[model samples]
Target: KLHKEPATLIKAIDGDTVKLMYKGQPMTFRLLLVDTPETKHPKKGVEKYGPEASAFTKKMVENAKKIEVEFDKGQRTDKYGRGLAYIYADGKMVNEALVRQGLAKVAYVYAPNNTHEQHLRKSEAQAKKEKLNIWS
Candidate 1:
């Protein structure tokens, strides 16, 4: 039997990180295969447009109650020791959302999941053309 976990957004840690409450446990998610400027890095400090990235993420995920997570070859744990997954809320995938909104770049590492890669690539290209975030 496949056990599915339910979670709700608590807050946005940064453009790429979100704090969620799963089964009453507060969990942090580092979105899979994409990288955004750092809003709050312990050692590196903040990067360009970091605040905007975080704000963008918050605007997209905060207060979302019915969220879904899909794992790749590795479930729930990434090499950097962060929880990695494709996040969805109300049938919208958060990873794609970020790219679509011009807030994130497609920085896939390791095995690429081609399913939604084209969409993300197109989104990133559009974002670049519009000079959003990184382009700015």
Candidate 2:
């Protein structure tokens, strides 16, 4: 049994962050279980492959015919109040695709929000083995 809340992507902040129109209001969501390289970190310059990662996410999310957000039965929001959830574009999971492309890494894992832990890790392993992009 899976639950998916319909959403519309307003904009992509980076590879891992997006602002979506959820419930008729815009909200920020941090894609759970993955982190991409820094694109605009104040403490650091743009990282290698960071822009590429951002572009990929923007394309996938913005071009999707449908978008959805799923909670993990754990903490739904972070300390900053930004929603944390899994992203779905059409029927495929967006977070997993980022890792599969070596554009993101499985990270920030916490208790109970690990519903897709194994799935995401497997994608990362495959990407690493193939030495794609960031993994190269």
Candidate 3:
């Protein structure tokens, strides 16, 4: 079984980024196996679909009945010390939802952390097929 810990949303940063209260500490999470367009990046500024991506995340995080963070069998933290995990809201993985909506793309699939890569890829493909959000 995977290591999944109960967490709560502190804030939703954008599509693929969020701050969570986990283990009595505030943890900023970078969702694994997905990359959402930048809404907060200093250099990238805001992508055309950034607002929609941000809004999607904001809606989900705020409306989530329960939130959790699941770790993969890979490196724990990123260079920014942000927790790298698969985020779950009400039993659904938020990472896959963003991809399925075309708000994010399947990416950063490094070894060992690709636990849900196949699922995310499939979601992205469907999003691409239907031309949703960024894909449009």
Candidate 4:
């Protein structure tokens, strides 16, 4: 059985951001290890693979029966109030899942926020080898 933590998903913003109710408060989760393609742009507009990435994220979240979140390293939150964390939906780590499926790339350039860096890297390698989605 999957671990069921006490977080209720509120919304999935694009591919790498999710809003959830944790500790009786709303928290925006910014995936720390993976970076999915952009779905929105202020001046440049949506990117080529952006829509596909968003769709994949939406599907993944909706399919999960339960969700959990955990922080890593410094446990910092972004300027937009997003916690730089990892999410486990159903039985899978959503961060690595996105990378493994080629919906996101391992884009960890920040220090101390790379607790799952190696796992994310391996997932990306598999995605690249399979040439899935964004890799295509």
Candidate 5:
């Protein structure tokens, strides 16, 4: 089970990150159990193939009618204070989509918040088999 909430997306920070608002207040989210290619790096700047993942995420939220977010169990925030969540764009699970679409890798699983751990792993495996996105 997950902690679900209605949200209005303010912007897409990168492939696996977003900044949104809830109840008219601002909040940031780091999509849990998923890791997209890094668009920007502190020392390296932009990474190879990072733009594609970033573009995909931008496309997901450019003008969506509905956007919702769900949090993993127990943990609410990471050390950076970003809310850990799963994003839904018009009923589609964005976190899972990244793996299915091969834009990200399944990673950083935390205790009690492993709702879709197995499913994410399966999706990543399938993407690998299919040679999709990052796995290629």
Candidate 6:
């Protein structure tokens, strides 16, 4: 079942999050399975390349007119019950994109919904090998 259909990208909150309109409803997605350096953490201070990650994410998703969301193993709710989804844009998965771009690290929080875990890991490795971001 398609939980959420493609909609307009309303805004980019950071490297790992987006506010978008889905089927006439506004939604925010903190991309699953990846954790970028902290750009907004209260005390951690901006990690290396954090701003680049944020800017990269913005370039990837901002203003995109269509987005597709797929839910695999976990419930659609995070710990706060916010809808958790793997977002795809223009046929490209956002989760894989982040990892592939070296903007995020694979983080497995929920087991079942981690369909893209292996892909994320591989992407991270590739990014690291190429010294894309973190490795650089």
| lDDT (Cα, tens digit) per residue for candidate 2, span 1-136 | 4499999989999888999999998999999999898797668899888899899989999899999999897888899888999999998998999999999999978988889999999999999999999889
**Model 1 ranges with Cα > 4 A deviation:** 1-5, 112-115
Worst 10 residues of 1 by lDDT: 108-117
Error of 1 at 27 (Å): 1.9
Model 5 segments beyond 4 Å from truth?
none
- Stretches of candidate 4 off by over 4 Å are 1-5
Cα lDDT tens digits, model 3, 7-121, are 9889998788899998899989998988888889779789888898889888988999999899999898999999999988898888898999999989967998888888889
TM-score of every model versus the real structure: 0.80, 0.96, 0.95, 0.88, 0.93, 0.86
Q: Order of all candidates by TM-score, from best down to worst?
A: 2, 3, 5, 4, 6, 1
Q: What is the alpha-carbon lDDT for the whole of candidate 2? A: 0.92
Ten residues in a row with the worst lDDT in model 2? 35-44
In candidate 4, what residue range of length 10 has the lowest lDDT sum?
1-10
lDDT of each: 0.74, 0.92, 0.89, 0.79, 0.85, 0.77
- How much is 99 displaced in model 1, in angstroms? 1.6
Q: Please, what are the lDDT tens digits per residue for candidate 5 over residues 27-126?
A: 9888889888787655777776679888888889766789888877768788999998888888888888889988999997877988889989998999
For model 1 the local lDDT of residue 116 reads 58
Which ten-residue region of model 3 has the weakest summed lDDT?
Answer: 41-50
* Candidate 1 clash pair list: none
Of the two candidates 2 and 5, the one with more favorable lDDT, higher being better, is 2
- Candidate 5 vs. true structure, TM-score: 0.93
